Ligand binder design. Sequence first.
Ligand SMILES: CC(=O)Nc1cc(S(=O)(=O)O)cc2cc(S(=O)(=O)O)cc(O)c12
Ligand SMILES: CC(=O)Nc1cc(S(=O)(=O)O)cc2cc(S(=O)(=O)O)cc(O)c12
Ligand SMILES: [Mn+2]
Ligand SMILES: [Mn+2]
Lengths: 146, 146
Amino acid sequence: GLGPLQIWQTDFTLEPRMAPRSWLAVTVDTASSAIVVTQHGRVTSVAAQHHWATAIAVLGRPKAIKTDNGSCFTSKSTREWLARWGIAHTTGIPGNSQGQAMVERANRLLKDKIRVLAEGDGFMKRIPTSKQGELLAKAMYALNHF
Amino acid sequence: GLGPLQIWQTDFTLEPRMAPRSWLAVTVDTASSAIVVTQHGRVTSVAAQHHWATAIAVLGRPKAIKTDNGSCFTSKSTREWLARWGIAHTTGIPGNSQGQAMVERANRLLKDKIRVLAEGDGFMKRIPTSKQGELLAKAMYALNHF
Ligand SMILES: CC(=O)Nc1cc(S(=O)(=O)O)cc2cc(S(=O)(=O)O)cc(O)c12
Ligand SMILES: CC(=O)Nc1cc(S(=O)(=O)O)cc2cc(S(=O)(=O)O)cc(O)c12
Ligand SMILES: [Mn+2]
Ligand SMILES: [Mn+2]
């Protein structure tokens, strides 16, 4: 059968409404356009690995993951975690090309959706910590399943 | 098109290897046989709701969820959370029938898989807390994607 390769794009984006764990790791599966998001307190190699561990459970094992050159992505620790799994790690193409547009678009939509849902629940600033998990899951659902 | 109805079965099972959060919530989608599992410190109405919030993000919104008559499932809080989402909540059929066999089978396979992976990593008893999340995600992946 002919179809798209299982290649992911992953990035981190800061969302203060979700503080203290305001670092959102976002993965777009370019083959299905599915979006997986998890929240973290810091942008470390270990946060990137925990995110992908969750994404693999949800989406399955990809052939390759495209990131920018953030240190959590280029560290020895992360290089070794990806090798343990047999996942190729790659980056942006030259030729005046940018990092990864699909995942940057997803960052924006995600942040828009979080704001819309939070304000509907009456949270004009930071979402109360005990409400964050379900609101994030509701944002992911809306971005994925119609 | 003709296919199966989107009906889930959900249950809790105790797994001391995953302590202090040793309560595993397990949902089987009867339509795809997909399995979603999350871990919790206690079996409360709020734990059940956080699990389903995650399952909805992963699997989409089901038409109905079958549980046994555990109190976390039959409380007012949980009845109201399911109504907010528009999800029917149902239970086992009479006629000498048991609770929900598919989800009970999944409970067993999950616990077998956790044990196999833990012992391979050298953990004969409780899995160190910082290792639990990725090991659980690896168990879910193996039970789902081949
Ligand atoms: C590997 C990878 O990331 N590939 C890709 C990245 C991006 S981008 O928008 O993120 O730049 C867009 C892509 C578009 C297509 S196509 O079906 O429209 O032809 C195919 C790709 O393979 C793409
Ligand atoms: C709603 C629901 O749970 N339905 C079901 C529960 C169980 S059980 O094993 O869990 O008892 C088995 C089922 C088997 C089938 S079939 O395709 O083989 O005919 C269909 C169902 O709909 C089933
Ligand atoms: Mn980045
Ligand atoms: Mn039970």
